Design an enzyme around this catalytic site. Structure first.
Site, PDB file in Angstrom:
ATOM      1  CG  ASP A  71     -30.095  40.526  57.250  1.00 49.23           C
ATOM      2  OD1 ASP A  71     -29.671  41.037  56.193  1.00 49.23           O
ATOM      3  OD2 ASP A  71     -31.083  39.702  56.877  1.00 49.23           O
ATOM      4  CD  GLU A 126     -36.588  39.637  59.537  1.00 49.56           C
ATOM      5  OE1 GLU A 126     -35.860  39.232  59.702  1.00 49.56           O
ATOM      6  OE2 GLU A 126     -37.553  39.933  58.493  1.00 49.56           O
ATOM      7  CB  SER A 138     -25.270  41.831  52.776  1.00 51.79           C
ATOM      8  OG  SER A 138     -26.512  41.050  52.635  1.00 51.79           O
ATOM      9  CG  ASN A 155     -28.457  38.343  54.215  1.00 49.22           C
ATOM     10  OD1 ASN A 155     -29.464  37.649  54.984  1.00 49.22           O
ATOM     11  ND2 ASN A 155     -28.080  39.795  54.331  1.00 49.22           N
ATOM     12  CG  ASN A 171     -29.175  43.204  53.949  1.00 53.55           C
ATOM     13  OD1 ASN A 171     -27.985  43.321  53.944  1.00 53.55           O
ATOM     14  ND2 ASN A 171     -29.894  42.503  52.915  1.00 53.55           N
TER      15      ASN A 171
END
Ligand code: CL
Ligand code: CL
Ligand code: CL
Ligand code: NA
Ligand code: RU
Length: 129
Positions: free
Chosen positions: A52, A35, A50, A46, A59
């Protein structure tokens, strides 16, 4: 902060993530690896607008507030920036809520695609825990 592999394992354990909802520590370390490459400052936008944040790329669509994700929620009741701290407490506390949501670690797409089913114990091999 960029954690080392055994350093992050130890902080995750301290904060109670080892075997939380049945997921061994190697699963969490493996999720963090893919990640964020263990970097607490990681951010990724994203397609839906949104973003992360942090070691586990939580998120803003559902879990934290960044003031720029229309119609989103803030279920961990935290500003997303808190998820970028050198201290991982906020990320861990919010990860616990995510993983309890019904789908376990599948909420993390990199965990499903790159960690699930693999020898995740290799991620904490040799660490003094
Ligand atoms: Cl927002
Ligand atoms: Cl920490
Ligand atoms: Cl599960
Ligand atoms: Na949000
Ligand atoms: Ru800590």
């Amino acid at each position: 902060k960029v954690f080392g592999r055994c350093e992050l394992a130890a902080a995750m354990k301290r904060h109670g993530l080892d075997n939380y909802r049945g997921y061994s520590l190697g699963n969490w370390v493996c999720a963090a690896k893919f990640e964020s490459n263990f970097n607490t400052q990681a951010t990724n936008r994203n397609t839906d607008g949104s973003t992360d944040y942090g070691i586990l790329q939580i998120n803003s669509r559902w879990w934290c507030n960044d003031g720029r994700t229309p119609g989103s929620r803030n279920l961990c009741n935290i500003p997303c920036s808190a998820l970028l701290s050198s201290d991982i407490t906020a990320s861990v506390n919010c990860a616990k809520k995510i993983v309890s949501d019904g789908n376990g670690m599948n909420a993390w797409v990199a965990w499903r695609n790159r960690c699930k089913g693999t020898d995740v114990q290799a991620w904490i091999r040799g660490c003094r825990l």
